[PDB]
C-alpha cells in the first residue's frame, strides 16, 4: 500500500493579524508549503464551535462552524466589509498565543457589519436559502445561539423560560419572531464559514493535499442536539445530564479525566437504526477527505460518571453497540476513509471493533519508550502498515517536552534505540525514526518540525488553563525546516 505523510496543525495555529488562524491567505500558503515538501495530508482539529475553555470537543453543535476562523480579508475582497473595519483592532498581545478571552468580543461588530451588507445584496436571500437546503441543520442551531445570547450566554440547562427549554411550539414561534434578526445573523455566519472552508478544501484537493478532519465522539450538554433531540441522551425533564462522560485513572497518573459531556442512550440509537450517527459520518466524509473518529474506545465501552460525583473515578464501564453501528455505516454508506483513534483502555472488545472495521488505528511513539524492555506496543518495531503513526498528538507533550521528563536511563535508552547523532536536536532524531516505520502514514506535529519548547503543547488533558493557544510565527518556517521535512519524506519513501 502507498506510503505517505502529513502535518498536524489546526487552523487556529496559522499566523495572521486577526489574533487567530483563519481560512485566509496563510491557509493557502500552508497548502503551498505542504506541496513544496511533497506531503499528502493536513490533519486539523475539529472545526466546531467552542465554549469557555476553548475546547472544540465540547461544542454547541456537532456540525456548526467555529466562527472565529472566518477571514476578514476574504470578506473584504467580497464587497461586504472594508478594512478600515478591522485594521488595527488588535486581537491579542503575543503573536504565538491566542487570546480567546474577548476575541469573540472583538469579532462581533465586524461579522455583524458583513452580515448586514451581505443581506442587502439583491441575490442575497436566494444564495442563503440555496445554502440552507444543503445544510438543513443550520436554522435551528441559529435559533439555539440566538436564545443563548438572549439569556446572556447562559447554558441551556440554566435558561429562565422552561417552556423554551423543552421547545413548546407556542414559545418557539414567539422566540423565532421576537429574535428573527439575530437568528439570520448566525445563519449567515454559517454560510460564510462553509463558503470559505470549501474554497480552502478545494484548493487543497486540487493540489493533491488531503484533509484529515476530527469528529468529537461527544457533544457538550450545552448543545442544539440536547435541545432538539434529547432522546439521544440520558437526561431528565429539565434536560440535565443523568451521567457525564470521562475516563478513569490509568497507571501513569492517578486521578483520571472528567469531561462533562452528556452520555448516549445507546439503546435509542440501536432502535433508531443509528440515524443520527449515519448523518454525522455522512457530513464528516463531505466535510473532509479522511475522517478521524476521536475516542474509538467509546464505541466498545465508555466510562460513565454518575451525578453526585466527587472525582471521575466514580463511574463504570458501560457497553456501547459498536459492531452494529459500524455494520450499519458500512451497509448504508459504503466503506469510508475513517481512521480510528484507539488510544487507552484497550481490551479485546476494542481490538475486535478495529479488526471488524479494517480502519487504521493509531501509534503514539511517545508512549513507547517508558518501558526500556522494548515491549511497549507503541515502540516502532511493533507497528504494522495499517496504522497512522504520530510522534505525539495534540494531547501529548511536544517532543522537546516529552524528552525532559524521562528517566535518564529512559533517555539513554531512547538515544540508543533511535541512533541520535551527537550535536543533533532530538526532534529531528525522533522524526527520522517515526518516518522510518512501516506505517502507511506518519504525521508530524508542526510544533516539533520547528523544534518548539514545552510551552507549545496544544492540549494538556484534564485542565482548563492555557490550552489551544499555540500559534506559529511565519518567521519560524525557515527554508531549513522545510528542507528537513522534504528530506525525511524522500529518504523514507513517502512522497506526494
Ligand atoms: C492517550 C492515553 O494515554 C494513557 O493511557 C494508556 C495508553 O494510551 C496505552 O496505549 C498504554 O500505554 O497504557 C497507558 C496508561 O498509562 C492515559 O491513561 C489515557 O487516559 C490516555 N487516553 C485518554 C486521552 C484521550 C485524548 O485523545 C482520549 O483519546 C483517550 O480516549 C482517553 O482514554
Ligand atoms: C471537552 C474536553 O476535551 C478534551 O477531551 C477530549 C480529548 O482531548 C479528545 O482527544 C477526545 O475527546 C475528548 C472529549 O470528547 C479535554 O482533555 C478535556 O479536558 C475537555 N473538558 C474540559 C472542559 C470542561 C468544561 O466544563 C470541564 O468540565 C472538563 O473537566 C475539562 O477537562
Author numbering: 2 to 497
Sentences from the paper on this structure:
Amylomaltase (AM, EC 2.4.1.25) is an intracellular 4-αGTase that catalyzes the intermolecular (disproportionation, coupling, hydrolysis) and intramolecular (cyclization) transglycosylation reactions to yield new linear oligosaccharides and LR-CD or cycloamylose (CA) products, respectively. In the present work, a novel AM from the mesophilic bacterium Streptococcus agalactiae (SaAM), with 18–49% sequence identity to previously reported AMs, was characterized. SaAM is phylogenetically grouped with AMs from the mesophilic bacteria, but has a similar size to AMs of the thermophiles.
Therefore, we determined the X-ray crystal structure of SaAM in complex with acarbose to gain an insight into its thermostability and catalytic mechanism. We found two ligands present in the active site. The first ligand is an acarbose molecule that had reacted with the catalytic nucleophile D295, cleaving off a glucose residue at the reducing end, resulting in an acarbose-derived glycosyl-enzyme intermediate at D295. The 4-OH group of the non-reducing end of the second acarbose molecule is around 3.9 Å away from the anomeric carbon atom of the glycosyl-enzyme intermediate. Therefore, we believe that we have captured the pre-transglycosylation step of the catalytic mechanism with the acarbose molecule resembling a non-reducing end attacking the glycosyl-enzyme intermediate. Thus, our novel structure also explains the regioselectivity of the transglycosylation reaction.
